[model samples]
Structures are given as C-alpha cells and as structure tokens.
Target: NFDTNMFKLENYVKEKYSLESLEIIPNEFDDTPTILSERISQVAAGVLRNLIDDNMKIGFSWGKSLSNLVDLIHSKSVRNVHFYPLAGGPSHIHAKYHVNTLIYEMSRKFHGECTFMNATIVQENKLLADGILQSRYFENLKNSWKDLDIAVVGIGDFSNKGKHQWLDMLTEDDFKELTKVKTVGEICCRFFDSKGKEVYENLQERTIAISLEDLKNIPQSLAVAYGDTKVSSILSVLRANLVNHLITDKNTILKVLEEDGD
Candidate 1:
C-alpha cells in the first residue's frame, strides 16, 4: 500500500494519473455548499499561488469553486499576471460566481491585468455567438487564452444537471439529445462522453467558448471540484487529459480512484 506519504491520496493520484500538481483537502464536513466550497477553495487557491509566474497569462472557466478560490486569494499578490475568462457567463445573471466577475476579483488580488465578457453556454443563437466572437472586445480574451500559462476551471456534470441551472438555456429537446449522446460532462462549455469524445450536435454550435483541444496547449490546466456527484464529470476530464492540475476534496478523490479502478 502507498501509505508512507502523509498525502496518500495526493500521491496515489499523481502516480496513477501522472499529474504533476494537485491539492486534496480533507472532506470531513457537513458538505453544505458554503462551508465545503471554502474549505476546498483554500487549497485550490494555494495551488493557484505557486503555479503563477511573473507576467503569466491565466484563464478561468466558471463555477462556484473557482469563485471561492478567487475570493480566498485576497492576502496574496503576484506581479503583472493577466486573467481572462475561458468561457462566457449566462446572459441574464449578475451573480459574483460568474466568470467575468471572478476574473475581475482575481485581478485585484494579483494586481494583474484582466478582461471581461458579458456572456457561453449562454448563447441562444449560433450567428449571434459567432458575431460576439468576431468582436474586437473578445480579442484580448482570445489572445490570453492562446498564451495562457495556467487555466483554473470547473467541471460541468451533465448527469447532475440540477446543480447547473445555467444549462436552463437548453430546451427539452436539447436535454434529450444530450442524454441520447451519452454526455457525461463538460469544461469550457464543451460537452463530452465518458471516454472524453466530443458529443452533442446543436449545443456544440450554440456554445462559444474555448475548445477542449486548446486547453491541452496550456502548461497548467487546473480543475477544482468536489463531491461524489461529480465523479463522472471529473473522470471524463481526467481521461481526456484536459487538466494536469487538480484541486479537490478527499471523498471526491476517493470516488475518482474507485471509479477508475486505481
């Protein structure tokens, strides 16, 4: 047994997944959203701290874990780094958890440069989404994504749709179609099946976010997620090699270890 290390789960994940960076917080709590997210975010922010370098470009994908991670970084500061959104937010909401808001808050923490977008997974029409992509305002984010050294993202568990109310943009037919395609998860609004193959027909067209293919180019793709409910989504990302760095809780990590037979 790999019990010599104090960070056994971390070691096991690194060994099995070949990941170079990880932070696994102990999952010994009631797991209410507020309490649990802060615990994991502390470690996630800690992971984010060391990975950043001077003038590095860092991109983000939206979720509560990421929002909390950004919040926890208040005491830290790094120089001249830039933050950009990896995907857009819902067109309607103004919640702090949205990607643009998160990036703005992160910029203040690092005293870094930043970019903003109004709205991915938010677009209702393909033509309008394409038009937004073509706008000059999107250029800064698009360029930063291409040059990003680190990406902090959240997983979208298709199976656990209730947690992701933003997906309400989709219709009954789209939901049925996603189910028909065996969709398990998404990162940056790009949904995939269990083996990490791209799935979905019309939804793919409507989404205007960074492609999973592009994420591979970044040196440090970090994902923050927790809970057994997310195991399937996390596995899809792991199998696809979408993230090299992971920040998660112990129970969730155990589920990943179990599901992948490690």
Candidate 2:
C-alpha cells in the first residue's frame, strides 16, 4: 500500500511541479511530532548522501526541518568540501536549531570545513545591516555564495491572519507591510507572493541570506517541506523555480495536486 502511494505521488508531482525527482514518505506519521520529524530526517539524509561528493560546497538554511536533517546525517569522509549557512545565524534561539550549529555538525561529519556567519538575521536599522554586510567576515560568507554546489532549504508559510513564528521578529509596521503584500510564504527568508514574485524589498535588505536570484544559480537546490499547512508555500516555491528537488509527504503531494485541479 505504501509503495502504491509512492508510485501515484511520483507521477503526480512530476507533472504538477515539473520536478524530475521527489522524495515522498508514507503518510503514516501518527505518532508524536518527534517521531515524525526523525523519520523525515532519515529520508533527507539518505538523499543528501547520494547527492554530495568530494570538493563540493554545500549550503544550508535555518529551521527545524534542516535541524532534523543535520542530526540524521551520518559521518562520512569527503575531500576539500565545505559547508556554509545560507541565512544569518540566530542570536538567542536554541543552539540545536542555529544555522551555525547545523553547519558545524555537518562539516565534522563530512570531514570538511565550514564558514559561519555570526550575526543577527534581521537588523533593526538599514544602516547597521549595511555596515555588518561590509565587514570582512560577513563579506567572505557573501562571496562564498558564488560557488555553491548545493543548497538545502525549508519553505515557510504565513497564516491567513499574517501569523508565523517569524512574525514576532518584525516591527508592527513591518508586519503590516508584509500582510499588505499578500505573501504566501518564503524560502531562505526571501518572502514571495502567490505568483512566486519577491515582496518587501526593504525587509529583504535587512535579512542577511542568499537572494533568490543567486539561489537559482546553484546546481542542486533541494527544498524540504510537507503537511497541509505548507501546501501553498511549497507550491509558491516550486512555481518560482527556487528549488530543483523536493522532499515531502504523500498527503502534501495529494493536496498540492488537488489544489491545481490536476
């Protein structure tokens, strides 16, 4: 039965998202969220292992999805490869969820090096954000984006009421402006609308991360997302040509196809 689900999902996703490959786990995660998270991590780790190689530069974005993926990655030896963060590292968040921590753990496993960005993701003022970007350390990280071989990212969705965990980071005016943009979701903190177009240029300037324009150039950009809650967000990312590969759940796949009347 599970294999049957996978077979149906494969064709559906390929046709709908125009993605050649997808990792669709069974819709059997009825246990605690922790158990479900670990299962997803396992699937992602297996995929990443096959996609990486010697002398590669891989980048990662922040969030629980990537945190789980990093934990499940088994130690493997590689030569001259490096891991880098795709977004600014969080300041006061849990250590396990920080982008730097994920890259550190991954680099050790891969037997490679890592470039860490030590700064707040969203500065309160544009002047401070510009100054930070001009620093030598930050500039090095920015330059690293030019040669990224692969990128792993998570897609974020805001609710109808303009609510999300990241909303707390925005000022009242910022939140209102984002709401007015009618954004469906974001990848790597780069918010976009339902039509997959970027929104809120000012906010994007303050958020230190790889831009969507740069992300498109990476050879292998994988987006890991699932659940009914993420249907619109995933659809937006795929339509934007933001990610080339997708790892998701069967239920989400079914919902995505149905949303498009496919």
Candidate 3:
C-alpha cells in the first residue's frame, strides 16, 4: 500500500491498490544478482526432475543460463531415458549452454540413445529448413521432436543486445515489425507477443527446429526462465498456451503475476 501520509489520496484510489501492489517493486535483496542465479538453477532443476520419468524422451534447448544449470545437477544418473539436443551446439569457441554435456550424458547414464541436430535450430531459408529436416542425420534427430513425451525449453529475451543470436539475421524492417507487435521474447527462434500470438512471417522464413503448433501439442512443455527482465517473455509464452509448465525464480514470478494483476 502507498504510504498513508506520503501523499494525499482519496478512498477510491486506496481501494484500488491492494497490499500486494507494494510487493511488486523489488528491494535491494530481491535484485541481488548472485541470489537470482542460484534461485534460477534450483527452480529449473526441480522442475526438470519432476517432468522427467523413467524411459522418457526429453528434448532440450540450450543457452548460457542452462549451462550454469548443468553444473548444479550433481548427477545425471537415471533409468531408461533418451535425451535429444533440440539444436546443434558445441564449443567452436565455447558452448553457451551445457545442453551437449548434460543432456547427452544424462542419456548415457540412463542407457538410452542421444540424438543431436547437426543444424542450428534457427535458420533464415525455408529450403534449407526443409532440406535439413529431410537429411539423413537430421531425420534421425527429427524423430525425437515428433515423438517427444516432454520438452524442456528456455524462453529468451530478443530485446537484449547480446542475446539476439537468432534475431540478428533479420532485416531492420523485419526486426521493427516484431517489436511493433510486442515480441519481447523468443523460444526456439519463434517470437511471441505479450498475449502469445506468434509473429510468424520472419520466423517461417527461418529454418526453425519446431513449429509453434507442434509445441502446443507436446504432452509436457516446460518453459523455464528467470530474472525480472524475463517476465514479459515468460508471461507471453504462458498466455499463448505454448507451454503448460513454467520454472522460474520467485522474483520473476512475482513480477510476472504483478504485471498481469493475476
């Protein structure tokens, strides 16, 4: 609630502001960077474990925060499960995420096969996309996406300069259009508005690994993201019905819920 004596206000405005409104503005402790990182990993691991089952086939997308998450996964030992890397990732310089190490090794421990896409998850040409999907290597990996029992994904903020790998390929006009429609974030090279409607034109031009329609049908789609900065992206993904489960830090949850007044 606003400080009663801080400003003159009528009863109606006071009635409008719930006590919860005050909590939306994070304090010094809430924004602590180290704490944020720890919370993100813990939440992500717990969510992933719960979604995982014996003999399950889980497909994963990769990025920096995800690599940090793998380090926190003390052991990958499991039973009868296969892991598929939803996109091609390796340390040409260094892997941004631990998808290769964690996902593949987890499958190994479970004594199950690991499928990796040799192609990048996002590309700009439809022909290249079709070709990759039909290629022998990608075909084997594509099987995983088609038969996925669960998908573990990470939401991305395309507005962040350093985080725009997939969007950087688009022309200035295309980028502007996405922004105009409130595409604050992306998942697997697909952008969505705060309401979750997909900005499909440029995305379709790309050789994305999966379609938004297909993502909706997967039995369990867990989209994990953290940080107050990602609230819009996460919320938009949720609103769009692209995913059923969300794994995020408390900070992000509060901000997201507060933003939506939910």
Clashes of each: 0, 0, 3
lDDT for model 3, on a 0 to 1 scale? 0.63
Candidate 2: lDDT over CA atoms?
0.80
lDDT of each: 0.77, 0.80, 0.63
Give the poorly placed runs of model 1, Cα more than 4 Å off: 1-6, 29-35, 91-94, 135-137, 160-164
- In candidate 2, what are the lDDT values of residues 44-159, reduced to their tens digit? 99899888899999999887788888888887777999998888543455688778888888887898788887777888877888888778767778888877999998888877
Name the better of 1 and 2 by lDDT: 2
User: lDDT tens string, model 1, 90-147?
Assistant: 5454477788888888877788888776664546777877777778977776666777
Q: Over 4 Å off in model 3, which ranges?
A: 1-31, 88-98, 108-111, 167-174
Better of 1 and 2 by TM-score: 2
Query: Best-fitting candidate, measured by TM-score?
Result: 2
Lowest summed-lDDT stretch of 10 residues in model 2? 160-169
Error of 2 at 31 (Å): 4.7
Clash pairs of candidate 1? none
lDDT score, candidate 3, position 41: 70
Error of 2 at 248 (Å): 0.4
Model 3 collision count: 3
